[PDB]
Symmetry: D2
Subunit: 115 residues, 4 copies
């Protein structure tokens, strides 16, 4: 509902399918506590991670398991994983889409935040 | 149907709404002939540009009017427009999404081609 | 340099070497006139395209021949080329670096502009 | 340089100057140990982080402090930082350039790796 992750593949020009994605919430002691996870679908999307009630303000980290993705395709990649670390803010719009565009030695990420 | 364009704004973290997009097809004499056009919606998307019957193999150019977009927001941008020039190939998958991510001095574009 | 182009390869984690680049300038009749061309070096850089005298005000198109680059590597890419179209030197002379980052189905570009 | 970081600003069309960068290396106990840090120069570059002796095999995290950069410019950005996490020098010593291109709600990074 309030958080969606979309992952695309810049080598093949396709969604990045069956990519593991883990979301963590920063705890008061500065550790990363598991929050939600899943695998991207055939459309490269991961829906249903959280609910509005659970997704309170705070710092979150989205870890995308890019290394496993590339290796399953027979490609040696540079990065251990990709990270997206951000603050959820109630003063801004209410739906967050985190998009990532993957290449073996590079990635790009953006946020699309809408009401 | 076979072609969708999606435009995002990296400054505001939002769809790029009401952006003019023009599609051209390369003619036999190497000129660019108008093919389809429209304005992105509230979701940053432009649907309905063409049909499967009309969208034959060939070289196409998608011109995104980024300059007008930025100026309507009060921002001075670098580029006159953004371009995406590609060949449509029937041997590949059947739906083309062209995505563009805009900043004042930079843009990024990818193709997502699915069946 | 008044105009420098740098190209990187996101698949190999390297400079993109031997990339052909053609620069055009819009003429008074609205056509695109050939302005300069060259190839990226071993470092992915292309220097020496123009001079401060020659690089007058105008609308310039930097065409990076990405398909020719990928095809020369035996890869079938999506785009024909990567374009950067911009007005230059309209507030006096500036130095422009146009950078591009290439993948078979995607590219990114940015500009770095300095005032000498 | 064994490790160099270059940061560009997509809103201003310039180097991103005075960007803080912290590098960590994963320790035997799986924690992230501080390895080196520094700030980008006027050219957007950060040199001198490490040496070929010190830059051994390992898993490194280059943390680019993008929020601190944007906030120092008076802009409220989305991300806390931009991370690049990679295994280095596992096939012998290499020279790594980590480049990043910043906007308030987006970033891109790439690696350029050469063999001396
Ligand atoms: C063109 C580009 N370069 N780097 C990125 C990330 C991108 C955007 C890729 C697609 O991003 C989205 C795609 C969608 C979508 O497909 O609905 C929604 C939100 C997004 F942010
Ligand atoms: C991080 C990114 N995404 N999209 C672009 C374009 C860019 C920046 C391109 C320039 O980055 C580099 C620049 C240099 C350099 O200026 O010498 C060397 C290596 C680099 F990787």
């Amino acid at each position: 509902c309030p958080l969606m992750v979309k992952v695309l593949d810049a080598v093949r020009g396709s969604p990045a399918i069956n990519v593991a994605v883990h979301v963590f919430r920063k705890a008061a002691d500065d550790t990363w506590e598991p929050f939600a996870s899943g695998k991207t679908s055939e459309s490269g999307e991961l829906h249903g991670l959280t609910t509005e009630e659970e997704f309170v303000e705070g710092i979150y980290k989205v870890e995308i398991d890019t290394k496993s993705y590339w290796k399953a395709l027979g490609i040696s990649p540079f990065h251990e994983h990709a990270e997206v670390v951000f603050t959820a803010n109630d003063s801004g719009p209410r739906r967050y889409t985190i998009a990532a565009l993957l290449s073996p030695y590079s990635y790009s990420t953006t946020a699309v935040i809408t009401n």
